[PDB]
Amino acid sequence: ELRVGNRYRLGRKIGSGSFGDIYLGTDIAAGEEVAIKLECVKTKHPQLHIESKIYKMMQGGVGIPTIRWCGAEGDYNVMVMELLGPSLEDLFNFCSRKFSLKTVLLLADQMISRIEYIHSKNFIHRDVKPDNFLMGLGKKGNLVYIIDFGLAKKYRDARTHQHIPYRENKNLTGTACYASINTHLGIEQSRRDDLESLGYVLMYFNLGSLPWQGLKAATKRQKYERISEKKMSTPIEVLCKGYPSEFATYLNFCRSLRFDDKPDYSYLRQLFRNLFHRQGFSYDYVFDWN
């Protein structure tokens, strides 16, 4: 029987992540289902070990999955991960690509907090998108988790908190559709960029689409140019027309942050909390899918 170590039976592919695919796993003894990420070792720049280290530095945070680095069985590096529930994109689809305002705001409160927590541990995520947020299981089915640290980067020194310098970006980039304007301009990402991307995710949930999705017959690398140009030419006020002004205020705030600023996470959450409460909502974790 093909197993990881002696413990995790390997199953079918269940998805993709940064730098490697994900397969279903079954603790032969415990019966518990896990996710197993595999990275081919044939590369001069391996990433999965680094990613496992970041997860380990985040462990114990609310909404951070538990992982196990297992080193290299033959041609693959192996990381075993807590199996979570559906992603927010999956749940958006279960909801026929319509979320209520209450659900968007329930999600927004937790997603800002998840990003704040990563930042508190000295990293930026750099690939904020719907598929990297997933709901927990069972008791923790009301908790939003954030996943995938393969593109994450330290933005400040752990001992001195000296911020990384403002420079042209060197590292690989996340999805074009949710990238910040600074990323399109070739500047190193910092805390502000993670939060700006979250603003595009929230407006995606509000709209069902973003105005820069949908593309032209081209080289694909042109396709990135198309997304960049439409995003930069679309004012936040046009993007957010017809939705509560807090979504536009949120995005303007993130765009106006200085590179090394500590974002006012509380302000951003409070914009949405006071909107949520003005509608008579309660933070009772009853999402549309419940």
Author numbering: 2 to 291
Reproduce text from the manuscript describing this model:
We discovered a conformational switch in the activation loop of CK1 that regulates its activity on two regulatory regions in PER2 that control its stability and circadian timing in mammals. We show that anion binding regulates the conformation of this switch to reshape the substrate binding cleft and thereby control substrate selectivity.
To explore the molecular basis for tau’s altered substrate specificity, we solved a crystal structure of the CK1δ R178C kinase domain. Both WT and tau coordinate an anion at Site three similarly. This alternate conformation initiates at G175, three residues upstream of the tau mutation. A rotation of the backbone at G175 to a left-handed configuration dramatically alters the configuration of upstream residues to create a distinct conformation of the activation loop. Two copies of the kinase are found in the asymmetric unit of the tau crystal. We discovered that the mutant kinase can take on either the ‘loop down’ or the ‘loop up’ conformation. The activation loop is not stabilized by crystal contacts in the alternate ‘loop up’ conformation and was explicitly modeled based on good density in both conformations, suggesting that the kinase has an intrinsic ability to take on two discrete conformations in a switch-like manner. Taken together, these data suggest that the tau mutation allosterically regulates anion binding at Site 2 via the activation loop.
